[PDB]
Design a protein around this ligand. Structure first.
Ligand code: FE
Ligand code: FE
Ligand code: FE
Ligand code: FE
Lengths: 83, 322, 491, 83, 491, 322
């Protein structure tokens, strides 16, 4: 288990979202969407959720997992819509 | 269709924008609308006659008395503010000087001077209360009546201090007779008969113009100079610092009365023959005033002087009016 | 330290003395004192139940005004008057015009006792009484003054008593008879016992409540504030009746109370009656003028009189009876003669109100309800002119109010005429005429409005001339308060 | 010309009504009705207006005129409905 | 006679002396005085613009309370609170809970200057300042006390600052930083110049107006009364900035003003912003929170700083920019996290309000409007649960408020993270982080709510536990003010 | 769902129906919620330390200080009513005694005694103001803090009379140096160094318990007995009836301070060892107090006595508390 700050796209506030060190970026975005999609942000089917480190903008591969991303506990991540 | 006015219609069109005083004290009396039948009843009722004769027929005349204005522009709201403060000062003195034992420090002589010259004043003072309250109900204008109102309250006030201080003194010197012996002193003591006659007689001068002169121009100045001024300074020099301060506190009220009494006279002089009317009345009562000052002050130590100062001080009150 | 009021109070009213440079009668003229053969010693038994001293006064009253004036300032800009029910605005405009100067006049009535009463307690209480009415005269001028820019009608808060508008005359008729032309002892009975302790006291309580209920806090504060002062000086009459009964004159006392109560009731049935049952919104009435009178006014008079050792007036049963009729007539009269008053009379006869009226007064629709029916059709059918008058009503010579009573199925309108010294008088009731007869010299040559019209004293001698004679002009002449809104329900 | 106080039947208030010394009672009632009928009292066709002196109840004949009725100026009269 | 205040005033503040039985530094500890190397003589140039003396004070303030307490009593039974707009009731409940005790706390802040300021003028003015906040603490407790029987939420007027409810923490965070933990000179700048003269003064004026407009005179009177006192003690900062600039420290002064203004603005964008643009009825808004800020707050800061010889803060343009975003976010945050506050947030996003918002803020519907769209559908479609949260927002470490900004088409939400000594910090803006960096020792080990949640300090470690940790329970936990009434317009 | 309460929740359940005093003055301080981190910032800030040490670690201990209640139950609303009246009394004295020329009646000797013993008190008084205002900000309970608040206002008040009267005296005797020479007198006159040391030192006793004792239990009684009591009676016998009354007017305030100071001590004695804590502090400062009374009063005529009466009168203040 590992905490991160979710800054979902089109949403208005960054939120606390607990993820797992084993989760792939895809799964991290899954956990973040739960707190934004259908709450403050409309779903976008023909789109894909990617995870980038908020501070520098590094874009993580969909398949990469939390352990391998070198994240600081509580690190803020952008969850943006891509193709 | 009559459109709304900027102020009362009787004040409409002067245009220094009326004051609260004017808004609430002017042109209020209505019995003066029909001098033939002042009250809404049979024109021959005794009250109709009394007014037809004592207000309307007064030789002291003016085309429009409602023009009168109290120089202090007193109103019920501001009278209580003014006096509530002054009472705070005075109740203060009473409370604290007492805590200090002030009354115990007075000599036996002075205590007796108080039973003789101070305390019986509850009568003379109440008499003035009665006197100023008669002026109130026979004057020809609500603004004159109002000055008379507050002045009557002031009198009841002086009467109240005296009543208060009489009981305080009685508790401190239970054998003197304080509170119990004043009526006899007021009624039989030579030093008092001067004032008692002046007031008992003045109290039946029903003409408003004469009541005003008899009471506010002659009697009061003399009572004020004899009982407040003279007795006060004496008290001060006799170690009675309370009566000295108290008397001074009341002199403030006396001065406000003189202030409006003057304004009235100033106004009355705007017309021929009134000064003569006012002087014949004063000429009539002045004699009874000197008799009061002589009977009272001569009995005080340093008599002849008190008599000379009170005599010219009270005269000075009228001289400065003309 | 300070003394206990208990300790020195008496000395403040130990002020009587035996005059000698003038006689007692000279100092206390009977026509002004009314000592009635009772002695100073006897009158010195006078002991006011509610005691107060100068310091306590200037202090307490200072606080009373701070509150009232503070409230008024705070709600001033809110301009509530502009969105208040028209029946309420009317109620106020009526209140100030008929009361402000008479309040001020009471100051003199109190002065009468302050100088001429032989009971020293009465003289001081009257001095505070004097001060109280001064407040009432001023504050009740100051307050309406805030609306002079809104309608000339507010100018009548000062102007009214200075005119010959029929209502003002009825007012002066009452006040001059009760407090301005009576001896000291008399004033304390007829004014403070009969009128103030008897009517205005309880009334003001309700008026303050009514105001509250109308969302008019400035006025609610004003009234209930004024009201708290009533107590301190309304007492004065009681101790006077006591001394009179305990000495020879129980009859003299009774007689004054009798007159004072009737004359009060009459003024009350045109100034208060019509307002409760018709100007106040139906949804804001917790009781009928009759219920009010029965609970808050009548019961208390009986306890009062019983305790003083007096009897109920000879007209008492008629009085209770008349609680069902009189004010309805005074209201219909005033509304019908709409343009002759300075405020807008609230018809108050819509379907719902008419139900209420029928409930509070069984038989109302069959009697009073009928005149109104006719008034309504004419309004429905576009004949407004038939709802205003073309002649004057018959004014009673005692209360100077129209002579009216039950119409409809139980028509019972009477006139207690009286020929006296070659002149025929008209009275609105048995009691009104009796007030004249027990003391004719007091009212003999007075002339009511009809009298003046019929004497040529009103010129031109027509309605236009009468209006001018009463200082009424378009702008202040009254019309239907809700502007006939209540009509469109009948269509 | 002569003034009288009209106390119309079914109405609620007595009113001032100027009549003429020459008027017959019928005409007096005419002048009174004007101030009451169709204002506060409904007309009654199948009825006749009679004039009676309010004080004692004396009923005057329809044809009698003001001069002959011995009325006091301002005298109050009842105007009642009869057959 | 009396002297002219002009004549003796100076003697009342000629109270400095050269200590000798103790050293100056001992008497005036730097950590408490902040004299900053400037001398007593130099500090004695301090001259308060608005002068007042003890007698004038006890007298004037006595009258102020008479009025306020009088009004409250008069309108008490009217129970206006029971029929007032729910958005208004909310507004008040918010006001008292976040201000009453902090008002009282300011009394101590003023005490800091009263004892530790070297400028004798400052010491006396602070003594009256001390008294003023005492009034504000008390009167602003006394007033809400009248409604404790109506809803437990009113109990928070006292309870709030004693809890760890997120809003209370943000409040203490601000007040403790600005006035409770600063040296005397500092307090006068950050508290009285920056905060009081800068924000609360003009604000209270509007709040008093708002109240008036809502028909709540008791509260309108209360506020504008309190407001009149602000002047007499808010001045204190000006003369202090002057002495600092006229001596070496213009930078030190500038820096405090910079911090004090930003931190004030942030607190202001969640406590005032949301209320004007969303709780106040649309028909009762004469300007947007932005318009208010621009006209009444910003202009004045520039004149002020210009006259003192200081500069506009480095963040000024961002600040003006943020007037278009920040409070919308704070409002959406608070509403969405509805149950975590003690009052009922007014959604305020109905068709008409949304038009207004779009007019006062071009682009609102495309950005902020969208989140609300989604919130509305779910409500229309019977999915309320998707409108409350299941997690905590990211709290800024400086202002202890959620980190939010523009959503929708122009999504621009940022987090100014900062790793400091092995711990990662989150800040809601450039300035908030800079406040931390120019003085890290001041905020370093403080932990915001998320920090405590993530540290296991909240148990159970779930939403229920967080609510309990913040002393919230059903009854005071907030929900939609108009009870979703605004929903049935979308159906 | 939590249903509405009858009063504040912290007062809920006593059931003499709270008083306005209690409703507005109890349990208000919040820095006492976390003794580890009193303020919402880094726990190591100097202000955190200052409170952790001077309020929390004070040897004067009690399980719950919020229980404290001012015997006079003062509130801002009633403080101003009380004092507005008292100021009316005093401004009254000033105004009228002046009208009377009171200051002109004082001898040359007494005028000099005033420049030496009376007027420089603006410093000692302001010092107390500072002293009571420090107690306010370090005390452990809003109700204790409040007593300190009003007492600080009282001090500024005494300072204001003095400032006022200093200018009045200066206008009457422009050559004496009034208003211009007090700092030197306060700083160099032997008669003053006693008090100046006591206060300068007491002013740095930061522990709230000790500040309270140093200032309210030792210093004030001594200042009050030397400057109000002793100088007052002297003034009275020297013909300065104003300072005699003024001093008495202020003694009223001193007494209200003693009243709550006692209530606090009464409360503090409810627990073991505090009386000993309080006595060690008094034992420490009493010596500096006697030094102040000796330096001041000995310079007054009839010195040794003033020294004996002030000494036992101020002792009596504490003796009556235990
Ligand atoms: Fe009255
Ligand atoms: Fe009255
Ligand atoms: Fe404040
Ligand atoms: Fe403030």
């Amino acid at each position: 288990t590992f905490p991160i700050m979710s800054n979902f796209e089109r949403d208005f506030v960054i939120q606390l979202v607990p993820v797992d060190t084993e989760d792939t970026m895809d799964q991290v975005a899954e956990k973040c969407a739960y707190h934004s999609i259908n709450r403050r942000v409309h779903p976008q089917p023909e789109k894909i959720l990617r995870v980038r480190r908020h501070e520098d903008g590094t874009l993580f591969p969909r398949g990469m997992i939390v352990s391998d991303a070198g994240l600081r506990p509580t690190e803020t991540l952008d969850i943006i819509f891509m193709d | 269709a009559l459109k709304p006015l900027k102020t009362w219609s009787h004040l409409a069109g002067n245009r220094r924008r009326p004051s609260e005083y004017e808004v609430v004290s002017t042109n209020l009396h209505y019995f003066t609308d029909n001098p033939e039948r002042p009250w809404e009843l049979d024109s021959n009722l005794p009250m109709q006659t009394w007014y037809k004769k004592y207000c309307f027929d007064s030789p002291l005349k003016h085309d429009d008395w409602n023009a009168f204005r109290d120089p202090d522009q007193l109103v019920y709201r501001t009278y209580n503010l003014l006096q509530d403060g002054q009472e705070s000062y005075v109740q203060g003195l009473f409370d604290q000087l007492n805590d200090r034992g002030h009354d115990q420090m007075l000599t036996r002589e002075w205590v007796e001077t108080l039973a003789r010259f101070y305390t019986p004043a509850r009568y003379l003072f109440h008499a003035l209360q009665m006197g100023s309250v008669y002026i109130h109900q026979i004057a020809p204008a609500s603004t004159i009546t109002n000055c008379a109102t507050y002045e009557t309250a002031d009198h009841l006030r002086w009467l109240t201090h005296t009543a208060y201080r009489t009981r305080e003194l009685a508790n401190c010197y239970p054998d003197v007779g304080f509170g119990k012996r004043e009526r006899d002193v007021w009624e039989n003591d030579p030093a008092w008969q001067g004032f008692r006659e002046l007031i008992e007689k003045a109290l039946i001068a029903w003409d408003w113009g004469e009541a005003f002169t008899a009471i506010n121009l002659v009697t009061k100045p003399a009572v004020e100079e004899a009982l407040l001024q003279q007795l006060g300074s004496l008290a001060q020099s006799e170690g009675d610092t309370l009566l000295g301060l108290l008397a001074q506190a009341q002199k403030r009220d006396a001065e406000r009365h003189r202030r409006w009494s003057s304004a009235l006279v100033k106004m009355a002089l705007e017309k021929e023959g009134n000064r003569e009317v006012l002087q014949k009345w004063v000429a009539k009562w002045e004699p009874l005033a000197d008799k009061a000052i002589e009977a009272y002050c001569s009995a005080l130590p340093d008599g002849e002087n008190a008599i000379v100062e009170a005599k010219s001080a009270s005269r000075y009150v009228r001289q400065m009016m003309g | 330290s300070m003394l206990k009021r208990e300790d020195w109070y008496d000395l403040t009213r130990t002020t009587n003395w035996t005059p000698k440079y003038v006689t007692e009668n000279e100092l206390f003229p009977e026509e002004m004192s009314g000592a009635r053969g009772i002695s100073m010693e006897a009158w010195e038994k006078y002991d006011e139940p509610y005691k107060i001293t100068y310091p306590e006064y200037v202090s307490i009253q200072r606080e009373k005004d701070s509150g009232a004036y503070s409230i008024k300032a705070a709600l001033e800009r809110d301009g509530f008057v502009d969105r208040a029910d028209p029946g309420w605005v009317s109620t106020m405009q009526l209140h100030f015009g008929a009361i402000a100067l008479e309040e001020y006049a009471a100051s003199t009535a109190e002065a009468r006792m302050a100088r001429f009463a032989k009971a020293p307690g009465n003289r001081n209480m009257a001095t505070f009484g004097m001060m109280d009415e001064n407040r009432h005269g001023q504050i009740q001028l100051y307050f309406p003054y805030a609306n002079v820019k809104r309608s000339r009608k507010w100018d009548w808060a000062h102007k009214a008593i200075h005119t010959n508008e029929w209502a003002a005359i009825a007012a002066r008729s009452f006040f001059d008879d009760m407090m301005m032309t009576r001896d000291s002892v008399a004033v304390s009975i007829m004014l403070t016992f009969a009128f103030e302790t008897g009517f205005s006291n309880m009334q003001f309580l309700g008026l303050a409540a009514d105001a509250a209920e109308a969302g008019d806090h400035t006025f609610a504060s004003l009234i209930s504030s004024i009201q708290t002062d009533e107590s301190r000086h309304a007492q004065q009459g009681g101790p006077s009746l006591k001394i009179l009964v305990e000495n020879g004159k129980k009859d003299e006392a009774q007689q004054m109370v009798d007159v004072a109560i009737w004359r009060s009731w009459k003024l009350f049935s045109v100034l208060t009656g019509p307002i409760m049952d018709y100007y106040t919104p139906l949804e804001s009435r917790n009781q009928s003028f009759k219920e009010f009178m029965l609970e808050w006014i009548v019961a208390q008079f009986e306890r009062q009189l019983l305790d003083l050792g007096l009897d109920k007036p000879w007209y008492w049963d008629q009085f209770m009876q008349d609680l069902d009729e009189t004010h309805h007539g005074m209201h219909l009269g005033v509304w019908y003669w709409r343009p002759t008053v300075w405020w807008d009379p609230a018809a108050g006869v819509s379907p719902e109100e008419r139900e209420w009226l029928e409930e509070k007064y069984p038989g109302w629709n069959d009697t009073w309800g009928q005149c109104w029916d006719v008034i309504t059709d004419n309004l429905v059918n576009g004949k407004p002119e038939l709802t205003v008058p073309e002649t004057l009503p018959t004014i009673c010579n005692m209360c100077n109010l129209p002579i009216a009573h039950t119409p409809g199925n139980k028509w019972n309108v009477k006139d207690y005429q009286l020929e006296y010294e070659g002149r025929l008088y008209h009275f609105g009731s048995e009691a009104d005429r009796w007030c004249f007869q027990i003391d004719p010299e007091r009212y003999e040559n007075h002339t009511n409005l009809v009298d003046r019209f019929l004497k040529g004293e009103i010129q031109p001698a027509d309605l236009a001339g009468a209006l001018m004679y009463m200082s009424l002009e378009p702008g202040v002449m009254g019309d239907d308060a809700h502007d006939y809104e209540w009509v469109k329900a009948y269509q």
